[PDB]
Design a protein around this ligand. Structure first.
Ligand SMILES: CCCCCCCCCCCCCCCCCC(=O)OC[C@H](COP(=O)(O)O[C@@H]1[C@H](O)[C@H](O)[C@@H](O)[C@H](O)[C@H]1O)OC(=O)CCCCCCCCCCCCCCCCC
Ligand SMILES: CCCCCCCC/C=C/CCCCCCCC(=O)O[C@@H](COC(=O)CCCCCCCCCCCCCCC)COP(=O)([O-])OCC[N+](C)(C)C
Ligand SMILES: CCCCCCCC/C=C/CCCCCCCC(=O)O[C@@H](COC(=O)CCCCCCCCCCCCCCC)COP(=O)([O-])OCC[N+](C)(C)C
Ligand SMILES: CCCCCCCC/C=C\CCCCCCCC(=O)O[C@@H](COC(=O)CCCCCCCCCCCCCCC)COP(=O)([O-])OCC[N+](C)(C)C
Ligand SMILES: CCCCCCCC/C=C\CCCCCCCC(=O)O[C@@H](COC(=O)CCCCCCCCCCCCCCC)COP(=O)([O-])OCC[N+](C)(C)C
Ligand SMILES: CCCCCCCC/C=C\CCCCCCCC(=O)O[C@@H](COC(=O)CCCCCCCCCCCCCCC)COP(=O)([O-])OCC[N+](C)(C)C
Ligand SMILES: CCCCCCCC/C=C\CCCCCCCC(=O)O[C@@H](COC(=O)CCCCCCCCCCCCCCC)COP(=O)([O-])OCC[N+](C)(C)C
Ligand SMILES: CCCCCCCC/C=C\CCCCCCCC(=O)O[C@@H](COC(=O)CCCCCCCCCCCCCCC)COP(=O)([O-])OCC[N+](C)(C)C
Ligand SMILES: CCCCCCCC/C=C\CCCCCCCC(=O)O[C@@H](COC(=O)CCCCCCCCCCCCCCC)COP(=O)([O-])OCC[N+](C)(C)C
Ligand SMILES: CCCCCCCC/C=C\CCCCCCCC(=O)O[C@@H](COC(=O)CCCCCCCCCCCCCCC)COP(=O)([O-])OCC[N+](C)(C)C
Ligand SMILES: CCCCCCCC/C=C\CCCCCCCC(=O)O[C@@H](COC(=O)CCCCCCCCCCCCCCC)COP(=O)([O-])OCC[N+](C)(C)C
Ligand SMILES: CCCCCCCC/C=C\CCCCCCCC(=O)O[C@@H](COC(=O)CCCCCCCCCCCCCCC)COP(=O)([O-])OCC[N+](C)(C)C
Ligand code: NA
Ligand code: NA
Lengths: 470, 113, 82
């Protein structure tokens, strides 16, 4: 006979192989999701006492976490919404029904390895995914995950996140207000002569303790969440900017005690980033968070294409103008600077009479004006408008993933402060093992109502002896 | 400004004024909040750099708000100490506010409408 | 909104015109156009000889044509050009 545990050189059992083969198409998803049932029925019919989905491969990934990681959303939808309605294959049912009165019924999804298994949880394997995992942003629309993260959020993380926000609001106020009142007179380091200068160095101490903070917290992101060279500069545009904020903020400490005025060049880039990095914490807010997702996409789709082409023209006509100037605007700065003003609506078409051919100059600016102000800035608005039409729900699904990554780092941070991750589900009995024991699966309730399934085929319904957990 | 109440007796003006309220609550509200993060973010960054008059947080939030309305002088103070810092710090403000975020606003209005 | 895919199809043609001028330019520098396909036998002529047509592979997968009506399949004596 064939051994259903199909461990191979790579370690992939049959369920693993069925995850690796999927394509997230309809014909293939319709197929592979079915096949698990019969393999699972047969695994429970021909070889009980071995639930087949806990098995792993050489790399150590369940078929659940292999579908979470390899981008298999319809596969993952099955394994999470798995509802087997027949005895002796029912312990493998993943979506139970704790009661059903009329149309209302309390689905009882299990949180087996969605959160807090000893390796490769579905939320980790989706949230802590690399960059090119297909469907990555849609894989949290899958129930129970959309309503589980909103459960952790409303219940645990919304209060620690808005605290971390506040502490970062005041870190900026303390760092701003410590930099606004810097000493202009002299070369550093400076003295606590006046009474206010004691409060100022305090805000400088408290400023650096947060620079080394976001430094280390940006190191251990690269030791906990090991990236690759492609995922440093992509998919992690936050852990770099808070880390980058610290580089300037610690160079500021180097250049303060290295006896230079260059600490200002770094201290000031830490402020611009630091307030610009408040736009991280929009991700606790649906309408502001999506807005900030609509900021990142523009900076990477539309400004990125735009500003590149814009600098071709700018330096293209700038060199063309300073070539024409003879002599003061005979510099490439003071002509790229003056031609950048047409962008911001401050272009003087007569910023130099020190030309030698006017028609050349005027033909050459109006060419720049038409091709940049009228064409290319307004073309940018058009492409934003087409972008916003594209990324409307594709930005809400990046948002729920931004929030998801926040919900999980929050768990890992407060693993001993208050409690563990809170386990986000009630340990409840769903039935009985095939070996004849209780099950006690950590399950997440979902009150659901359906006004068409009038018959209410009983099937699973567990606390039908009760009615609504009373 | 409260004359725009009485557009509600007019179908095309009334709907227009409904398209005013939604923008003020959807698009300006999201916008102006983020805009004031950057504005005060770079304003503090600029007056921190200025030494001396534009050494105020008003006269630097005020001058940086002018890039919005198309009246930004990129040389409104020679009383800096590092030019590349100053210029990197404004063009960052200009790109992120005038080119990106005001035009992004038009896009979101367009999707709102 | 109009020219979204109508500009990608002008793009692939811009690239196409570039791919062909590049062939004509380097007709003696390095090689000919490289011929962009493996001379492979596909069957037999109706006059009873080999065919040897310059062919371009396209690995394709279809999860609905389960029957796999054999029909043409040429290196079925082999399995995957090994
Ligand atoms: C000497 C030094 C020289 C410099 C080079 C050194 C390297 C530069 C730094 C590297 C980075 C360069 C960035 C360039 C601009 C673009 C920034 C941007 O798209 O960020 C979005 C980010 C999103 O979050 P996350 O990443 O967590 O989410 C990701 C993300 O959504 C992903 O798609 C999903 O898979 C998933 O959701 C999740 O994986 O949002 C934030 O991080 C908060 C908001 C941050 C601000 C956003 C506005 C942009 C400001 C840029 C300018 C900075 C301010 C001015 C400074 C002046 C000069 C000093
Ligand atoms: C987002 C990142 C930032 C982007 C910023 C974008 C801003 C624009 C671009 C900024 C970067 C490049 C600026 C030029 C380099 C400095 C030299 C210079 O200005 O003048 C040099 C002169 O000669 C020239 O100006 C022409 C030579 C150009 C060679 C460099 C190629 C730049 C490529 C990129 C160009 C764009 C192509 C498209 C790019 C895709 C010498 O220096 P000077 O001191 O000026 O001369 C004084 C000499 N004198 C006193 C003896 C008379
Ligand atoms: C729609 C409603 C209106 C919105 C208006 C938006 C406009 C922008 C924001 C406007 C509101 C806030 C402005 C700052 C408060 C006044 C203090 C000041 O300007 O300077 C203080 C200095 O120190 C600083 O400037 C840095 C300290 C900032 C602390 C306050 C946090 C503000 C939070 C919100 C910030 C945005 C964060 C994002 C917000 C989401 C002291 O006051 P001064 O007199 O300037 O100093 C002279 C002292 N001297 C003479 C001894 C040298
Ligand atoms: C801000 C509103 C938003 C809400 C948030 C509130 C945020 C906190 C608010 C306020 C906290 C600060 C209050 C004490 C200073 C007041 C007296 C003083 O010196 O005034 C001077 C300004 O201030 C300075 O010159 C000091 C520098 C700023 C202090 C930065 C915070 C320090 C960290 C500790 C903070 C607590 C954290 C830890 C808590 C456990 C008056 O200016 P001047 O004398 O004319 O000129 C400057 C002096 N000089 C010329 C000699 C250079
Ligand atoms: C110093 C002695 C204490 C006195 C300070 C006085 C306070 C002045 C404030 C700030 C000055 C304090 C030092 C600066 C720290 C840097 C900022 C920081 O850590 O932000 C972290 C906050 O998350 C935390 O866990 C913060 C640590 C606890 C701070 C305790 C003081 C708060 C007191 C006041 C509480 C008032 C409560 C009122 C309630 C109504 C950021 O969170 P994160 O999770 O790292 O996520 C971002 C990083 N990522 C993008 C890379 C993912
Ligand atoms: C990433 C992995 C971990 C990094 C390491 C872990 C720690 C990282 C954190 C902190 C450690 C420090 C790192 C930076 C170096 C300190 C400054 C310095 O050396 O200045 C030198 C000069 O400097 C100047 O002349 C210009 C200084 C201002 C530059 C402003 C930008 C700051 C960039 C910030 C970095 C962003 C980098 C972005 C990264 C992509 C001083 O040396 P010197 O020989 O005395 O020169 C004197 C010259 N002078 C007299 C003419 C003035
Ligand atoms: C709590 C924060 C305390 C902070 C105190 C500090 C001052 C206040 C700071 C900021 C204002 C925050 C107020 C929050 C409460 C409003 C109502 C609400 O819940 O959201 C509503 C409004 O949403 C907002 O008002 C969010 C705006 C903050 C975005 C952060 C980016 C820049 C911060 C720069 C800050 C400068 C700081 C310098 C000055 C200190 C929208 O609803 P929602 O939430 O989207 O709907 C459910 C969302 N859910 C699906 C996730 C469940
Ligand atoms: C878009 C496709 C790319 C095309 C790229 C190539 C385009 C280049 C176009 C043209 C090339 C030639 C123009 C410059 C002439 C050389 C200088 C000269 O001798 O000037 C003479 C003056 O002459 C004038 O003052 C009259 C200028 C006539 C041309 C005006 C329209 C050209 C632009 C049409 C655009 C349509 C584009 C197509 C769309 C319909 C004499 O010298 P001066 O010292 O100047 O004399 C005093 C001058 N002053 C009295 C003014 C003070
Ligand atoms: C896709 C690519 C982008 C397009 C690239 C090509 C674009 C090429 C762009 C522009 C080309 C056309 C302008 C040429 C430049 C002027 C040179 C000249 O002769 O100056 C003389 C003009 O003398 C006259 O008699 C001018 C009469 C027509 C109006 C001038 C143009 C208005 C500029 C706005 C047009 C906006 C609309 C823009 C539409 C083009 C000046 O002579 P003077 O010495 O000062 O003598 C003073 C007294 N006098 C004037 C009575 C003599
Ligand atoms: C009647 C008012 C007398 C006022 C006299 C005062 C002067 C005149 C004042 C205002 C002009 C009003 C003229 C009304 C008649 C035009 C034709 C029409 O019926 O509507 C048409 C034009 O619609 C408009 O012209 C409406 C413009 C007024 C909007 C109010 C906002 C600001 C007012 C600031 C005022 C500054 C005041 C300071 C100076 C005095 C459109 O058709 P409709 O109606 O949309 O179609 C059917 C609508 N239905 C479905 C509801 C049936
Ligand atoms: C977007 C992600 C966020 C990034 C945040 C961090 C970005 C921060 C970036 C850079 C940090 C360092 C810049 C400042 C240097 C410190 C001051 C200094 O020593 O200046 C030196 C001058 O030096 C110059 O004049 C040349 C400046 C070279 C950098 C120009 C491009 C940087 C921006 C690239 C943007 C690409 C962004 C990515 C997109 C491709 C000496 O001092 P000074 O007194 O100035 O000397 C006279 C000067 N003067 C002759 C001009 C009068
Ligand atoms: C998503 C986040 C947003 C982006 C954030 C990052 C954005 C970072 C933005 C800008 C970074 C790039 C500019 C650095 C600032 C200038 C510092 C400097 O060295 O000044 C010197 C330039 O010396 C030169 O040789 C300049 C040559 C290139 C043109 C100047 C830039 C044009 C500004 C428009 C660019 C528009 C396009 C914008 C694209 C960036 C000045 O030297 P000087 O003492 O005056 O000497 C005079 C004579 N000399 C010039 C011959 C020497
Ligand atoms: Na303007
Ligand atoms: Na203007």
């Amino acid at each position: 006979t064939a051994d259903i545990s199909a461990r191979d050189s790579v370690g992939n059992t049959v369920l693993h192989a069925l995850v690796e083969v999927a394509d997230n198409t309809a014909d293939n998803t319709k197929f592979v999701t079915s096949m698990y049932n019969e393999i699972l029925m047969l695994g429970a019919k021909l070889h009980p006492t071995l639930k087949l989905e806990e098995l792993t491969n050489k790399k150590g990934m369940t078929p659940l976490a292999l579908a979470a990681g390899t981008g298999k959303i319809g596969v993952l939808a099955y394994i999470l919404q798995r509802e087997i309605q027949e005895p002796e294959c029912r312990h493998l049912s993943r979506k139970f029904t704790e009661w059903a009165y009329g149309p209302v019924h309390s689905s009882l999804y299990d949180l087996s390895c969605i959160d807090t298994c000893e390796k490769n949880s579905v939320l980790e394997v989706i949230a802590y995914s690399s960059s090119e995992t297909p469907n990555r942003h849609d894989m949290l629309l899958v129930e129970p995950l959309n309503r589980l993260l909103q459960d952790k959020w409303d219940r645990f993380v919304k209060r620690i996140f808005y605290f971390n926000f506040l502490v970062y609001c005041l870190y900026m106020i303390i760092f701003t207000m410590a930099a606004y009142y810097r000493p202009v007179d002299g070369l550093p380091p400076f003295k606590m002569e006046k009474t206010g200068d004691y409060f100022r160095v305090t805000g400088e101490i408290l400023s650096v303790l947060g620079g080394v903070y976001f430094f280390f917290r940006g190191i251990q992101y690269f030791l906990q969440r090991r990236p690759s060279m492609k995922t440093l500069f992509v998919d992690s545009y936050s852990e770099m900017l808070f880390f980058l904020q610290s580089l300037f903020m610690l160079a500021t400490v180097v250049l303060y005690f290295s006896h230079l005025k260059e600490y200002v060049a770094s201290m000031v880039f830490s402020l611009a980033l630091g307030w610009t990095n408040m736009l991280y914490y929009t991700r606790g807010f649906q309408q502001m968070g999506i807005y900030a997702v609509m900021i990142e996409k523009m900076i990477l789709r539309d400004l990125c294409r735009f500003m590149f082409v814009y600098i071709v023209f700018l330096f293209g006509f700038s060199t063309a103008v300073v070539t024409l100037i003879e002599d003061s605007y005979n510099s490439l700065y003071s002509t790229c600077l003056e031609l950048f003003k047409f962008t911001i609506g401050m272009g003087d078409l007569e910023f130099t009479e020190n030309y030698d051919f006017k028609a050349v100059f005027i033909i050459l600016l109006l060419a720049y004006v038409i091709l940049t102000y009228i064409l290319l800035l307004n073309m940018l608005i058009a492409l934003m408008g087409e972008t916003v039409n594209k990324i409307a729900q594709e930005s809400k699904n990046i948002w729920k993933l931004q929030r998801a990554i926040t919900i999980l780092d929050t768990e890992k941070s407060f693993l001993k402060c208050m409690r563990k991750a809170f386990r986000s589900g009630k340990l409840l009995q769903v039935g009985y093992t095939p070996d004849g024991k209780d099950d006690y699966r950590w399950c997440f309730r979902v009150d659901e109502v359906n006004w068409t399934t009038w018959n209410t085929n009983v099937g699973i319904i567990n606390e039908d002896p009760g009615n609504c957990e009373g």
